[PDB]
Amino acid sequence: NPIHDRTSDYHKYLKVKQGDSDLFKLTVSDKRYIWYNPDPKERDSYECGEIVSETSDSFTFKTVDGQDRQVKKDDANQRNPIKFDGVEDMSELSYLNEPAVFHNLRVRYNQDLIYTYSGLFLVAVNPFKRIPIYTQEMVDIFKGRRRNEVAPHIFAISDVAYRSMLDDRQNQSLLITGESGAGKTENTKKVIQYLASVAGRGVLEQQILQANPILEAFGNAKTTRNNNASRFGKFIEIQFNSAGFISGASIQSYLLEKSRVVFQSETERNYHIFYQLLAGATAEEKKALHLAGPESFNYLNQSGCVDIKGVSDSEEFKITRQAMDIVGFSQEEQMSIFKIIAGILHLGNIKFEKGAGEGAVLKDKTALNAASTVFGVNPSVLEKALMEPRILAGRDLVAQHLNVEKSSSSRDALVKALYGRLFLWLVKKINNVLCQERKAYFIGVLDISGFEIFKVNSFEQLCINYTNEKLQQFFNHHMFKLEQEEYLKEKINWTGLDSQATIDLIDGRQPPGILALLDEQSVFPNATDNTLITKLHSHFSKKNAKYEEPRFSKTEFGVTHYAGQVMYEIQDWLEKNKDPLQQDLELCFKDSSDNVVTKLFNDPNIASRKKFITVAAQYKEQLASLMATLETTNPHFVRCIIPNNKQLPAKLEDKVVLDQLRCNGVLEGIRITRKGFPNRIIYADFVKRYYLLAPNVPRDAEDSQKATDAVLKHLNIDPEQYRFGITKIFFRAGQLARIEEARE
Ligand SMILES: [Mg+2]
Numbered sequence: 007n008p009i010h011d012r013t014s015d016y017h018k019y020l021k022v023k024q025g026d027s028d029l030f031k032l033t034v035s036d037k038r039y040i041w042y043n044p045d046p047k048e049r050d051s052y053e054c055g056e057i058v059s060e061t062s063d064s065f066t067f068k069t070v071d072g073q074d075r076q077v078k079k080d081d082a083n084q085r086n087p088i089k090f091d092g093v094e095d096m097s098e099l100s101y102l103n104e105p106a107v108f109h110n111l112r113v114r115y116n117q118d119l120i121y122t123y124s125g126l127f128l129v130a131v132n133p134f135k136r137i138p139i140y141t142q143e144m145v146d147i148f149k150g151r152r153r154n155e156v157a158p159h160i161f162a163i164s165d166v167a168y169r170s171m172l173d174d175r176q177n178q179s180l181l182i183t184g185e186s187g188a189g190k191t192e193n194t195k196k197v198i199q200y201l202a203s204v205a206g207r208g209v210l211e212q213q214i215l216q217a218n219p220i221l222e223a224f225g226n227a228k229t230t231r232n233n234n235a236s237r238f239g240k241f242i243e244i245q246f247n248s249a250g251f252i253s254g255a256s257i258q259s260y261l262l263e264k265s266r267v268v269f270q271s272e273t274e275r276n277y278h279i280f281y282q283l284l285a286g287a288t289a290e291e292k293k294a295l296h297l298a299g300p301e302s303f304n305y306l307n308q309s310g311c312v313d314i315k316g317v318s319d320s321e322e323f324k325i326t327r328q329a330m331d332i333v334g335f336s337q338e339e340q341m342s343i344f345k346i347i348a349g350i351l352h353l354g355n356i357k358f359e360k361g362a363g364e365g366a367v368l369k370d371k372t373a374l375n376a377a378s379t380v381f382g383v384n385p386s387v388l389e390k391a392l393m394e395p396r397i398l399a400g401r402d403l404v405a406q407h408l409n410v411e412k413s414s415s416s417r418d419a420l421v422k423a424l425y426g427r428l429f430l431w432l433v434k435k436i437n438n439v440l441c442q443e444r445k446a447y448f449i450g451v452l453d454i455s456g457f458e459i460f461k462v463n464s465f466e467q468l469c470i471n472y473t474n475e476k477l478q479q480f481f482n483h484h485m486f487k488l489e490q491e492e493y494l495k496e497k498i499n500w501t502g503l504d505s506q507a508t509i510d511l512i513d514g515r516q517p518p519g520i521l522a523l524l525d526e527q528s529v530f531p532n533a534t535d536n537t538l539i540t541k542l543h544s545h546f547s548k549k550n551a552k553y554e555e556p557r558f559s560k561t562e563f564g565v566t567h568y569a570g571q572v573m574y575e576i577q578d579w580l581e582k583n584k585d586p587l588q589q590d591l592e593l594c595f596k597d598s599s600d601n602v603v604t605k606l607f608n609d610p611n612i613a614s615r616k617k618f619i620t621v622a623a624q625y626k627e628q629l630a631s632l633m634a635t636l637e638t639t640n641p642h643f644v645r646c647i648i649p650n651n652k653q654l655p656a657k658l659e660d661k662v663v664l665d666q667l668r669c670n671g672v673l674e675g676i677r678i679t680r681k682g683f684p685n686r687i688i689y690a691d692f693v694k695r696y697y698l699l700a701p702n703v704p705r706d707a708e709d710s711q712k713a714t715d716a717v718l719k720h721l722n723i724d725p726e727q728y729r730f731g732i733t734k735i736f737f738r739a740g741q742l743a744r745i746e747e748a749r750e
Pocket of ligand 1: 190192234235236
């Protein structure tokens with residue numbers, strides 16, 4: 007049994023290596039240390055100082071290069087005794103200050119132990135290298151094991167959720183969030199791998215597993231932070247019958263980055279599918295789709311990057327086509343998907359020219375025709391809908407001759423609409439195959455970004471930060487409910503409203519919040535960026551404590567989020583909220599001869615947001631349905647963390663890491679925890695380690711509570727620092743570290 011065989015891969019890769027002995031005496035030391043900042047302007051870079059003496063309210067310590075500093079006891083970050091280095095749950099630490107939390111993570115990360123609990127959270131730090139802990143053999147170890155019987159792992163939280171589903175008869179959710187490159191999608195895939203194995207058996211399992219490469223081909227791209235970045239969020243429901251076997255699955259997607267189709271920043275790529283197609287198509291597909299190399303398409307030849315190191319786009323095309331076969335897209339469906347992809351690239355090569363007054367005409371029709379052929383549309387109808395759309399102006403419908411720039415924007419809008427709708431069609435198609443109208447239970451997995459705070463923040467950042475306000479509020483309420491249950495159950499008296507202001511500033515109706523004011527401006531076609539930002543300042547500047555009008559910028563505003571202030575710029579929000587596409591372009595493509603393209607334009611479930619609503623209103627409603635579903639589940643929270651910004655292994659950077667722990671709720675959770683009784687230990691466990699600290703207890707004394715009390719009395723510990731629970735002693739912060747340091 008690998009859990010008990012210390013030579014196994016389980017022990018080597020997931021545990022701190024255990025020596026011949028764990029006796030208290032091995033770890034005895036008279037040194038006491040403090041974590042301190044060598045430079046006080048760097049709040050989260052620490053070094054270890056040896057305390058050399060103390061007064062009533064201060065410590066004096068030696069810094070690393072020999073200099074005496076002093077610190078008030080009340081301000082000190084004491085270092086946990088060495089036995090605590092490597093513990094599997096931060097809730098086991100006696101000193102719970104920030105550098106002590108970072109130290110335990112780093113100790114573990116130094117041994118390639120990338121998973122560590124913190125109370126309710128599983129903290130997962132990307133190793134940026136392969137560690138072989140996700141094999142079938144590794145799956146089998148976690149089957150049926152309680153959290154406290156096996157090491158931290160995404161498989162163990164997956165098993166606890168599965169058993170809770172079966173035992174409590176309650177749907178479950180796993181919320182997996184964090185920065186780009188942190189590992190969320192890979193962990194999401196491991197949860198699905200795990201459930202398919204413990205609960206599967208089959209062709210349905212295979213289809214559920216193959217849904218993923220399809221959506222990654224279409225919704226992931228190389229960015230500067232991740233070679234395989236997800237540019238859409240997702241919520242996957244894995245469905246079960248009441249006997250606990252997988253019966254189905256459903257996928258909801260969110261915030262697909264449609265703008266990447268038409269523009270990529272330097273060294274970034276477009277969506278993988280465009281390179282796959284070009285690399286992987288047969289000679290006969292290339293000629294039928296009129297394809298050349300990526301250097302021949304404006305939508306793929308601007309960033310300077312068409313290749314990803316270690317990735318073969320033609321081998322990935324094969325993988326994507328195999329996935330499609332297995333889910334059951336027909337050969338004709340697949341061809342039409344590739345026709346849409348090829349036609350977008352052809353659209354992007356249309357070059358608009360001035361032909362007189364502007365004008366915009368097409369002198370070479372080759373790209374127009376190629377696009378028209380592949381989409382099944384009339385090129386003369388496409389041409390006019392692009393450059394001379396008929397516009398309603400009062401009661402008159404008149405063709406307006408657009409100039410080159412508006413013609414080019416309209417073409418871009420068409421491309422983004424084709425891409426967005428195709429993606430939604432793909433999701434619906436996969437759902438039609440996988441989804442069970444009659445599931446008994448589900449485990450839902452959310453894989454989305456945590457808070458996004460960039461150098462520039464725009465409408466999509468406000469959306470995902472609004473989502474993360476809700477999810478952090480949900481976690482807070484959950485944490486409050488479970489802590490009070492724990493204290494109740496052990497009979498111990500100790501005794502997200504916070505998030506509501508920010509949420510109301512964003513989504514309030516009366517008085518109107520930011521999205522309501524955005525939506526109001528959206529019915530006025532001549533409203534501008536300036537009219538919108540002015541309205542926002544008029545309502546909130548100096549009037550709402552979570553908002554800030556900048557000192558100087560005229561296009562930005564600040565929101566105080568859970569994770570700190572975010573500055574947003576409002577350029578183009580009015581356009582983003584309406585997502586406009588000329589009606590003559592809808593009309594052109596509504597009459598397509600292609601059986602996929604017609605759906606993108608004639609099925610109102612795909613072609614339109616529902617009835618009339620804006621993009622913000624739809625985002626608010628989809629978030630409220632998501633929250634409604636999560637509130638019916640027993641949730642589990644996974645916080646993925648990136649160790650540095652360079653995609654390098656073995657380089658865990660304190661400032662990068664701690665900033666994420668502050669943003670994602672981990673440090674706040676600990677700060678709240680550490681105030682009550684954070685260490686709660688099964689009496690027999692306590693006795694088993696500490697019996698030699700007192701006379702006449704019996705390492706296995708049958709009366710565990712009494713023997714615990716014997717040691718506490720013998721050491722004369724202040725009774726205010728502990729509480730006897732029905733099954734555990736509860737300790738205030740620091741107390742257990744002082745017991746660990748007592749004399750044998
Ligand atoms: Mg991802």
